[PDB]
Amino acid sequence: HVDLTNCDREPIHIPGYIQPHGCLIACDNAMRMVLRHSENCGELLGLEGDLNGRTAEDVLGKRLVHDLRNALTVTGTTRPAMLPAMETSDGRSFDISLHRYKSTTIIEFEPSDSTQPLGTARKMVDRIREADSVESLISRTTRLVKATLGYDRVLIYRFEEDGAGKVVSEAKQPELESFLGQYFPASDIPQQARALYLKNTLRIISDASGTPIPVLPAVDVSGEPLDLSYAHLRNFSPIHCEYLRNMGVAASMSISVIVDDALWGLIVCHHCSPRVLSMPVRIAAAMFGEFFSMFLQVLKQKRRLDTINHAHAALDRFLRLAAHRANLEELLVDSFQDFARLIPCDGVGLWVGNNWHGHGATPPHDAIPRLARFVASVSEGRVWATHALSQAIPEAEIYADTAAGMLAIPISQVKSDYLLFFRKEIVQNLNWAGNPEKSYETGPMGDRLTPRKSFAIWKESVRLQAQPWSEADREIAETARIALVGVAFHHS
């Protein structure tokens, strides 16, 4: 059905099963007729037999059906309508999620559990609005979510440029192992999963060791499956199921962090026992996720601003000194190390008049002329940067542990003079806070579905590679070029 070969392309949006903590009824575009339903619809709503081919008013009752249909008008959108505490025909009270996607009305029922959403959320959002840095926001959010929603572990996953995830914050029970500073490969969250996570803010798993409920029909006469993209009861991949089971995790709740309309990362809650949050608590958690997302976005913007301002101030100081020095070359020889304040780097060097001066982690004196010649050939009077030097210069491999990434800044419009910034390979700068000799119980699919193997797979994928140069890094580097080229032109 699915394994480690075709799970990168697994159609998770159309599993044909839901989770047992609720029941689902699929109706036509207009919600006149019941096209599909979950096997457990009878056991929960107290109805007998097959509901398929019956009318809406027949199953739910004219009273309820009218309220649902009017909530679709107020909706429009694919964003699901939340209707807490609604009465059926036979009195029973349910929390109802209602959405419409691919002209099919999907209705999800939960036994109602009536918390005030606005109250819980407002308390949480107040405690994060004060945060003055990305670091202060992310560190306090895991601590706050764990305290409020009472999960055993709360992680924040940040997606790197390569799609890999880094655990950037953690609140856990003291007995559980830490994943803080641990990376996981892009493959561990395939593209189709990232799509749904971008479409649904919130994502719940009541019981990883739960019995999934089939949807009937599993496929319709057209050969069309039920697309559960926006359904909160949508069942989960048996691959991820096995991953959570191998970890000692029985329940999960993830929140999507959207920043500049991109999946930035996930707030992920793990529980060691089964756990469902009521619709009200979910509404609050979702509201919190939106505000967390918005606040992180502004802090990201503020951080970028400060970095570029700091770089502009640093370069002004330099240009001021260059006006009061006769010989610019000896100023650059005295000053080049100070340029390490502009761009995060493990080392910086000056290649001027076929002479080399290094500071921090740089290639050995031997390798610099070869590097300088290479830079001169491909630079073309512009900033040149790679995070994978060995892919460009295969003999660079020998010193990757010291310098695996390089950003080159030409400092002369004419002569082949360069300011070089270096970064150690990413595995050298690992501040892993986890357990080396902590092993995991495996399942049918093998030891691939453990954090130990995931981390080991990622570490292999980034061998001989440094932290990629951010757009901020390349923007500053370009501003630094213009400044140095500009003042170098003045001194002739």
Pattern 407-446, a second copy, x by CB under 8 A? ------x---------------------------------
DSSP-based three-state secondary structure for 20: coil
CB of 8 or CB of 224, closer to Cl ion? 224
**115 or 237: CB nearest ligand EL5:** 237
As a whole number of angstroms, the distance between CA 195 and CA 258 comes to 12
- Least spacing, CB of residue 82 vs ligand EL5, in Å: 20
Strands 405-410 and 418-423: antiparallel
| CA separation, residue 36 to residues 26, 39, 232, 398 (Å) | 5, 10, 17, 62
DSSP state of 454: H
| DSSP H or E run through 252 | strand 251-259
Asked whether position 489 contacts a second copy by CB under 8 A, the answer is yes
Element (H, E) at 204: strand 202-205
Contacts (CB under 6 A) with ligand EL5, residues 11-40: 12
Does the protein bind Cl ion through residue 322 (CB under 5 A)?
no
Residue 240 interacting partner from Cl ion, a second copy, ligand EL5, none (CB closer than 5 to 8 Å by kind): ligand EL5
| Site size for ligand EL5 (CB under 6 A) | 27
Please report the sign of the dihedral spanned by the C-alpha atoms of residue 272, residue 275, residue 281, residue 285. positive
Helix (H) / strand (E) containing 306: helix 279-323
Answer for which of 3, 43, 126, 334 binds a second copy (CB under 8 A) is 126
Per-residue contact string for residues 159-198; x = within reach of a second copy by CB under 8 A: ----------------------------------------
| Residue number, 186 or 485, with CB nearest to ligand EL5 | 186
* Residue of the chain from 226, 268, 279, 311 that contacts ligand EL5 (CB under 6 A): 268
Q: How far is the CB of 384 from a second copy (least distance, A)?
A: 15
Please report whether residue 236 would count as binding ligand EL5 according to CB under 6 A: yes
Q: Does 315 help bind Cl ion (rule: CB under 5 A)?
A: yes
The strand order across the sheet containing 213-216 reads: 17-18, 213-216, 34-38, 23-28, 104-111, 93-100, 81-87
**Block residue for tokens 């300088």:** 372
* Least distance to Cl ion, CB of residue 379, Å: 21
Residue number, 7 or 333, with CB nearest to ligand EL5:
7
Joined together, the tokens standing for residue 265 give 């990362």
User: What's the rounded Cα separation, in Å, for the pair 318 and 21?
Assistant: 64
What's the min distance (Å) between Cβ of 241 and ligand EL5? 9
Nearest to 466 by CA among 437, 432, 427, 436: 427
Specify the amino acid at residue 131: A
**Distance from C-alpha of 452 to C-alpha of 325, rounded to nearest angstrom:** 56
From 9, 66, 102, 302, residue interacting with a second copy (rule: CB under 8 A): 302
Q: Does residue 112 sit in helix, strand or coil? A: coil
Q: Which of 256, 275, 153, 243 is nearest to 199 (CA)?
A: 256
Query: For residues 290 and 202, is the Cβ–Cβ distance under 8 A?
Result: no
Contact between 397 and a second copy by CB under 8 A: the answer reads: no
Q: How far is the CB of 404 from ligand EL5 (least distance, A)?
A: 24
Choose the binding region for a second copy from 131-139, 172-180, 194-202, 472-480 (rule: CB under 8 A).
Answer: 472-480
| Rounded CA separation 369/380 (Å) | 17
Query: Residue ranges of the alpha helices (H) in 213-252?
Result: 238-247
The region of 86-94, 306-314, 381-389, 395-403 touching Cl ion under the rule CB under 5 A is 306-314
Contact with a second copy (CB under 8 A) among 178, 229, 297, 379: 297
Report how far residue 43's alpha carbon sits from residue 79's, in angstroms, rounded to the nearest whole number: 28
Secondary structure in 3-state letters for 408-443: EEECCCCCCCEEEEEECEHHHHCCCCCCCCCCCCCE
Tell me if 137 contacts Cl ion by CB under 5 A.
Answer: no
Given a contact cutoff of 8 angstroms between Cβ atoms, the answer to whether 451 and 182 are in contact is yes
CA distance 325 to 106: 74
* Binding flags for a second copy, 268-287, as an x/- string (CB under 8 A): -------------------x
d(CA 329, CA 219): 74
Among 276-284, 304-312, 342-350, 353-361, which window interacts with Cl ion (CB under 5 A)? Answer: 304-312
Binding mask 263-302 for Cl ion (x = CB under 5 A): ----------------------------------------
What is the separation, in whole angstroms, between the first and last Cα of the chain? Answer: 72
Among 239, 281, 400, 464, binds ligand EL5 (CB under 6 A): 239
Decide: is 477 part of the binding site for Cl ion (CB under 5 A). Answer: no
| Residue 305 interacting with a second copy (CB under 8 A) | yes
Contact residues toward Cl ion (CB under 5 A) are 312, 315
Contact residues toward ligand EL5 (CB under 6 A) are 4, 7-8, 10, 12, 157, 179, 184, 187-190, 193, 203, 236-237, 239-240, 243, 252, 254, 266, 268, 448-449, 451, 454
Contact residues toward a second copy (CB under 8 A) are 77, 118, 122, 125-126, 129, 287, 290-291, 294-295, 297-298, 301-302, 305, 308-309, 312, 380, 413, 475, 478-479, 482-483, 485-486, 489-490, 492
